[PDB]
Each structure stands twice: as C-alpha cells, then as structure tokens.
Amino acid sequence: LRSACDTVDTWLDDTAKGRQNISPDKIPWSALKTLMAQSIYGGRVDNEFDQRLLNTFLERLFTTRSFDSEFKLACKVDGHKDIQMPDGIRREEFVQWVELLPDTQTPSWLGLPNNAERVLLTTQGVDMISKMLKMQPAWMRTLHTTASNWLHLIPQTLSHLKRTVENIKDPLFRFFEREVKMGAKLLQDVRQDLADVVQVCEGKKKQTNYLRTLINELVKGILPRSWSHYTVPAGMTVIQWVSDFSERIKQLQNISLAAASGGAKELKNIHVCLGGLFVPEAYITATRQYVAQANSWSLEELCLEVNVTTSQGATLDACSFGVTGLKLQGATCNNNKLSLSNAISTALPLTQLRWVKQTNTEKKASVVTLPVYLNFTRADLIFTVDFEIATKEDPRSFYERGVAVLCT
Amino acid sequence: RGMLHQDHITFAMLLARIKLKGTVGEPTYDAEFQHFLRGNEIVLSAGSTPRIQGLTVEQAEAVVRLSCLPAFKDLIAKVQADEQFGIWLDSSSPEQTVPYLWSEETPATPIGQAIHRLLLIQAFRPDRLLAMAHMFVSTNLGESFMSIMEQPLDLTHIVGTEVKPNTPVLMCSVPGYDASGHVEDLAAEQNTQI
Amino acid sequence: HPKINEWLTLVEKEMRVTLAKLLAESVTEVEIFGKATSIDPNTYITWIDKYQAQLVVLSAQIAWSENVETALSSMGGGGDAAPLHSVLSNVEVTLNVLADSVLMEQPPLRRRKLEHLITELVHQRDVTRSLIKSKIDNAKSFEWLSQMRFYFDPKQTDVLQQLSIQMANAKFNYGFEYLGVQDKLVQTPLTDRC
Amino acid sequence: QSHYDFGLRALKSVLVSAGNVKRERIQKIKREKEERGEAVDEGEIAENLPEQEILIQSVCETMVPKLVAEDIPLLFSLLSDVFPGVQYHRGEMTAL
Ligand SMILES: Nc1ncnc2c1ncn2[C@@H]1O[C@H](COP(=O)(O)OP(=O)(O)O)[C@@H](O)[C@H]1O
C-alpha cells in the first residue's frame, strides 16, 4: 500500500506540476496500472491466473470512468444493490462515505459468489461452540481388523507393460509405462507392509524399527511417508488415501488389461480419469505428442479444445481423447457453454480433449480459459481449457469468481 | 484488544451470559443454553429421524434433536404447516427474520426470544449462527458493545493513560503484519525519542 | 604516489574517467552508423574492434534510444507519419550485418562482441516492433517510458555524469566499472519485468 | 530419477556445447578442405552444415551419461520423433 501511494504521488506530481486541477484523462492510468500489476502488487504473484485476476481488478478500478457519478465500485452485492462511487473531491467526504457503509458484507463485495463463506462461517460457529464448551491390547485388535479390511479392499495384481520396438514410439505407451510401473511398485510395497502389520498384530513376527514406526503412524491415522509418492492434499487421513489408492490401482489394472490385448488402438480409445493418474500433465503432453506424431506436426502449433459430452461412452475421433472425473467449480456447463452458478461444484460427465492446428486467430472476446487444478487446494496446474460463456455472461465475472476445473 | 478477531464473539457471548445471570427479571435459561452447547451429542438412531420435506438430513437431525426442548416439542408440525418456510430458509440473512416456531404460555422477554431464535438458527442455518450470536449479544449488552472492535486501534490514549511504565506493551502480530511502524509513527507524533 | 592505496585509487578513478571518455568517442562514432540506411560491414567491424565490448553495447543502446526518442518527438502531433519504421529498418539492417558477421570465422573477442550486439539488437528490434504495433506517438507514453532508455549529454562538464539511464521512474548514472567481457543475458519478458 | 534435471541450466549448457561443437566442426571441415585440394568458402560451408546433427551430438554428450539403462532407448526415440532422420555417431577416442 505504501509503495502504491508513493507511485501515485510521484506520477501525479510528474503529470501535474503543481496545478490545482487536472482532467481525469490526463491522469497516467496506464502507468499506475502497469506498475501495480507488474511491480507493486504483481511482484508477489507467481501464478498466471492470479496475475490475470489482478489485471482484471486494476483495469476495472483504475480508469477515468471512476471519476463519473455512475461508477460502480462493486456490482451484484446482494443481487439487487450495488456500491456507488463517492462523488466527493476531498478526503473528509470519502472517509464519511466509508464510515457510512452497511454493516452487512458479503463476498459479492469482493466479486466472489455469496456461497464462498458458507463453509467458513459454519466452521467458525462450530469452533465458537467448542470454545464456549471448553472453558466451562485393544489397539492391536483394532489395527489387525483395519489392516485386514485394507488388504481385502486393496487389489492384488498389477502387471507391467510389455515393451516392444513399435510400442516405444507411442507416447501413450511411454507414459502408461511409468504409470503402471510406479503403481505396481507402490502396490507391492503397501501390500507387503500391510501383511507385515497383520502378522505383527497376530503375535507371529517380532516388531522391528520400521514396523514400530509404521504401526505408530497407523494407529494414529497418519499416512506413512513411505507410501506417499504421488501428490495428495496435505490434510488427508489414511482411510481416504487407501480408498483413493485402491481406485487408482483398479484404473491402472483396467489400463494394463486393455493395453495387453489389442495393442495401441484401444490404448488411444480408453477412458481415463485425470484425478486417478499419478502425473496427469504427463498424460496431457503424451496425448499432444500422439496427435502430433500421427499428423506429423509440432507440439507448439497444436492447441487444445474441450467438448463436454451430454453422456459417457460416445465415440471419439483420431485426434480426440476422453477424460472423466473433471469438476467445474462455480459454474455449470450446458451445450459446451458455461453459465455462472451458485453451486459449489458440477460434475462434468466426460470431456473430449481434441488437438487441432493453430489458426493464429484471436479469441472471439467471449471465450474464457480455465485452469484445471489437480485438487481443491489449487496448488498444481495441470493444463488449461477453453470454453465459451453463455449469451449474457462476462469473462471478467468468470475470472473474479474463481471458476476452475478440478481433476478430482 | 489482545485477542484474535474470531474469538471476540466467544468472549462477548460469555459476558452476555454473565450479565444475564445477574438480571433479577430474567430466567436462568439453563436448559436452552445447555442444549445450545451440547445438543449435537444427543444420540439418536437412524430410524428415529424422519424426512421433513424441504429439509436435508442434517437439518432434520438438528430439528429432531432440538425438539427435545419443551418449547420445540411440535417443531415438525410447525415447519410442515408453514409453506413459506423455505423462503426464509433460503434467505440471504435469515437471522434478521427468524420465524416464531416455539410455544410459550407467556410472552417471553426479548432476551429469551433471542435464545430461541439462536437455537432455531443453529438448527436450521448453522452458517448464519455467528451473526445470530452477534445479535444475541446486542440484546444483552447493546448494539454498540462490539463497535469499538471495528474501529482502528487508538494507541495514543492507551499508551498514555492505560499503560503503566512497568507494564510492557506486547504487540503480537500474525505473519505478514508488523507493528514497528505503528510505534515509530506514535513516537513521531508525541515528539518522543525512541 | 608510492603508497599502494594512493595509486590504486588513482588507477580506479582514471579507469572510470577513461571509460567515460572512450564511451563519448564511441557514441560520436556510432551516431554515423545510426540514423542511416546502409551500413558498410567493414567500418562497422572496425568500430566494433576499436572499442570495448561493454562500451560497444552501451553505444548501440544509446544510439537506438536517441533514435526512438527523436522519432517519437517528431510524432508529437499525433496525426503525423511514422518514422519508427525507419528506426526499425535501421535495427534490421544492423542485425543483418551482425547476422552476416557471425556466419563466418571471427576472432574470439570480436565474436563475443558480435554475440552481445546481436542479443542487444534483437531486444531493441522486439521493443521497436512492440512500439509500432501499439501505435505509440508520444515520448511521454508509458509504453516507451517503461522501456530502459539511455541518454547521452555531450555538453556535460563531468564525463561520469554524461550518460543517464532511465526506466520509467528512475534516474541512474553509469558506474563506469570496467566489466571486461561479461556473458550477456537474453532480454526475455521476465528479464524486463525484473 | 533423483539425478535427472532438464531445466534452464541444462538447456543453456546444451546450447553452449552446440555452439562449441559447431565451431569445432567448422574448423575440422576447413582443415580437411585445406589439406584436400584448395577450395574454401564461408557461405558454402554454412549452407552445407548439419546443425541438427550438432544439437543431437550436444544433447547426447550432456544428457545421455546421466540416463539409466532403460531411458536411453526412450531418449533416442524422442530424438527420432522431434528430430527425424538425424542420427548421432559417437566419437571414437582411439588414443584415449
Ligand atoms: N534471460 C536469460 N538469458 C540467458 N540465460 C539465462 C537467462 N536467465 C537465466 N539464464 C541462465 O540460467 C542459468 C540459471 O540461472 P541462475 O542465475 O542459476 O538462477 P537461480 O539464481 O534462480 O538459480 C544461468 O546459467 C543463466 O545463464
């Protein structure tokens, strides 16, 4: 804030050499916007979509239109009202306007959907209840049962892919090779550890240091560090990890079974879930490489367009792949068009990722690019998708509301 | 002034309860407060909870737990009878317009009415609980009770009068915040070398 | 000055002053190559060999900055034609000469000078293309101000204060430290933001 | 693998090695043409210069030693895919 005020002072003194009044157009809007988007506030930003949102806010607020009587500081604060730009010309009246703001504030003041703070307020209320209230061997058998249930739930077999002279040239095979190999290694390690835990809980084999640490982590429900190999949300228990790992092993089993019989043809035509893949971005680049190799093109001239089907199981072209499990946050998809929604998430049934040659044409001013994050933490960016907004929406409003796609 | 902003409501509500216990003309409200604190611990079987139209499983569970209170014995009948109840349940700020769904043999004081709307808010719209709690405090301690907590902190008067030289001024900041600039500015204003 | 520190200080000061004077001579020699349509490769290579690598790149930057500044000043009326293309053309032909010079065998020092010049002229070409595409017609516009610009004032009594580097808010003087032959970086957009 | 790196440092090392390899190939071709007959021209040498072979040689000189056994066929397949036709003949250090 101090840096931004200093920038405003310096540029206003430079533009206005002591003059009492200047036209709003003569104000260096571009200088302030660029310095605040690249140096002052954009310096901390290390994400392209955060920088996009910062640019959106700066281009909304810091223009000459802010000096008119009709300027809206915020819109759709409650669906009916909006925040008006004060018409004052002195500090006192601006402070008076600030002191007269309504006490009720919603995330729509910030451009976010109103349902953004529902979970936060619910958790805060539960915490307030807990704080008000606050200031007013069997473990062997339980672990044995838990580990037996885990072993029964977890699959058993995952065979490696079969390398061949013509199989190596296929990027899909090159990536599913890593996937199946890592899955088999993790499966074997986890099953061996769980069997050792079961045998320890029966008093049949002596507990060792590794077994001691593993059991200590298991009884208190922390994911063992020897099992955590792929990216997962930080605060995830061991039950959830076991379930997710079982689902991933089932999906990899289907992948291996399909690839074993038929070759690379059904390999192209297999339905995959990006959330279950260990490195989904490698899958995306492998499909890009496959399309490029089939068409004898380059990767950098291939762009991706997404087509959300109304149903699962539709046939695919030679340059389109099908992925499932994607979730759209804060918006709904109908007929490949996005509408701003007040729901938390909408399950995309099946989306076709299609690679086509770039036409070097600019977007149609109604197309939004949405990040596809791995999980709800939005810490990993897998890739970007392009949709077209509804007939009466705004891409800027899409950016301000944090619309994004999650792989799981 | 030395508490995180999330714990202001807890201390204010405890002060409101303390003042309530000191009011000659008010009931003690032991049962309602005890339920408000420890009603989620009431064990109920899956079959005991019915499916009330317009209410999810969590809201229905909260309703059937809250029905144990004498004033909410026929809560299910009242919510089913009132058809415009869904409009309130999907309101932006339902706490401002909590409907009268509790039976009383006598017109309760505004404070007890506040506890009743607060229990209803917890059962129906837990996300709007805090705001409801705030209004509860306003009924017990005044609307301005929290007002000073919304204004910028006034270091001048506090360090000039309320702070003894023996008592150090501990300035605890969450990461990303530093109070050194505030102290330097304060010393600059008073023309005191620091 | 038999004392080690005295004559070492004299050597450092004379290094700075000599570099400043050599830069002045380099600028007054390269202003022929700039502001022109055709460049003879032989005299350009002679100028490159005569002067220091850092001084050569600095003189190229000064010449391009002055050319763009005068071109923008000539369009202060808004409706005037665009001489920036000529400036761009100048850069183009210079780059072509440089592109021809590295295609054949060169001495290692002159080869490194040529690579530095190629990098700097590629950056200048990109900046000029960006200016032309955005239709910049004012020298006070931020699209030109945001760029790093070099100004040489031959009528300054102090040789060390003759060159000024400005990037949209900041006034720096060249330190005239002898950097030898450094490994220049490609001026990516991230480098410009930095 | 823990010792794999394909960032900006590896890329810049590959580029500098490519420049050095191009220079040494130019010198070797020049010496061969001086010793065999008498005809040298900078433009002719530049036109008949296998730059893709130079990049492939630099990549295999820097990236191949770090690869594990199974990744060598994979990397050569990627080389064939991104650089079709070109092949890398490793130098023979007879005296060494
Ligand atoms: N703009 C650039 N042009 C040319 N080379 C660059 C550029 N930026 C970085 N590099 C190269 O990348 C390598 C790594 O950069 P480095 O200074 O080590 O970054 P860090 O300090 O983050 O480790 C360096 O050898 C440098 O030569």
Tab-separated table of C-alpha atoms in Angstrom, chain B residues 33-116:
chain	number	residue	atom	x	y	z
B	33	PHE	CA	-28.025	-22.895	26.849
B	34	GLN	CA	-27.086	-26.456	27.805
B	35	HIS	CA	-28.741	-27.709	24.623
B	36	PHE	CA	-27.133	-24.948	22.535
B	37	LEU	CA	-23.739	-26.115	23.787
B	38	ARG	CA	-24.156	-29.911	23.890
B	39	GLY	CA	-27.113	-30.932	21.710
B	40	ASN	CA	-25.112	-32.466	18.870
B	41	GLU	CA	-24.081	-35.164	21.377
B	42	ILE	CA	-27.651	-36.440	21.846
B	43	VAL	CA	-27.553	-39.989	20.483
B	44	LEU	CA	-30.370	-40.791	18.044
B	45	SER	CA	-30.909	-43.840	15.860
B	46	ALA	CA	-31.105	-43.590	12.076
B	47	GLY	CA	-34.751	-44.669	12.000
B	48	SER	CA	-35.764	-42.115	14.631
B	49	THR	CA	-35.010	-39.245	12.241
B	50	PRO	CA	-37.835	-38.720	9.708
B	51	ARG	CA	-37.642	-36.966	6.323
B	52	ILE	CA	-39.166	-33.493	6.602
B	53	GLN	CA	-39.937	-32.021	3.187
B	54	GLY	CA	-37.628	-29.136	2.325
B	55	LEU	CA	-35.039	-30.087	4.964
B	56	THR	CA	-31.900	-32.117	4.335
B	57	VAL	CA	-30.735	-34.965	6.567
B	58	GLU	CA	-28.508	-32.678	8.653
B	59	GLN	CA	-31.259	-30.105	9.200
B	60	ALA	CA	-33.751	-32.872	10.010
B	61	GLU	CA	-31.303	-34.340	12.537
B	62	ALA	CA	-30.838	-30.913	14.121
B	63	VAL	CA	-34.620	-30.422	14.241
B	64	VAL	CA	-35.281	-33.771	15.902
B	65	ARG	CA	-32.511	-33.080	18.428
B	66	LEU	CA	-33.888	-29.607	19.195
B	67	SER	CA	-37.429	-30.982	19.566
B	68	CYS	CA	-36.451	-32.406	22.973
B	69	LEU	CA	-36.925	-28.923	24.426
B	70	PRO	CA	-40.469	-28.265	25.719
B	71	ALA	CA	-40.866	-25.116	23.608
B	72	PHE	CA	-39.959	-27.002	20.403
B	73	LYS	CA	-41.975	-30.172	21.051
B	74	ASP	CA	-44.131	-29.668	17.923
B	75	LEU	CA	-41.422	-28.116	15.741
B	76	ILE	CA	-42.001	-30.638	12.938
B	77	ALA	CA	-45.706	-29.790	12.765
B	78	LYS	CA	-44.950	-26.058	12.714
B	79	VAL	CA	-42.324	-26.297	9.963
B	80	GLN	CA	-44.516	-28.567	7.829
B	81	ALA	CA	-47.559	-26.313	8.294
B	82	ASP	CA	-45.670	-23.161	7.244
B	83	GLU	CA	-45.133	-23.365	3.480
B	84	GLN	CA	-43.272	-20.055	3.151
B	85	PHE	CA	-40.660	-21.561	5.493
B	86	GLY	CA	-38.455	-22.430	2.517
B	87	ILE	CA	-38.226	-18.764	1.523
B	88	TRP	CA	-36.825	-17.924	4.957
B	89	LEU	CA	-34.569	-20.995	4.924
B	90	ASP	CA	-33.045	-19.797	1.628
B	91	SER	CA	-32.904	-16.136	2.674
B	92	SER	CA	-29.658	-14.187	2.453
B	93	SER	CA	-29.832	-13.177	6.143
B	94	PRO	CA	-32.492	-15.373	7.786
B	95	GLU	CA	-31.346	-14.343	11.274
B	96	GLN	CA	-32.965	-10.919	10.824
B	97	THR	CA	-36.375	-12.557	10.225
B	98	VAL	CA	-36.402	-15.716	12.354
B	99	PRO	CA	-39.993	-17.027	12.435
B	100	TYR	CA	-41.830	-17.742	15.680
B	101	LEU	CA	-41.879	-21.553	15.932
B	102	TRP	CA	-41.755	-22.061	19.716
B	103	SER	CA	-44.716	-22.400	22.072
B	104	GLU	CA	-44.936	-20.049	25.058
B	105	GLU	CA	-47.527	-19.805	27.814
B	106	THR	CA	-46.350	-16.229	28.495
B	107	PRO	CA	-44.791	-13.531	26.291
B	108	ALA	CA	-41.064	-14.010	26.804
B	109	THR	CA	-38.642	-11.135	27.225
B	110	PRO	CA	-36.564	-10.088	24.193
B	111	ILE	CA	-33.532	-11.885	25.650
B	112	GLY	CA	-35.263	-15.262	25.898
B	113	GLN	CA	-36.697	-14.685	22.443
B	114	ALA	CA	-33.098	-14.143	21.323
B	115	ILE	CA	-32.033	-17.506	22.774
B	116	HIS	CA	-34.979	-19.132	20.990
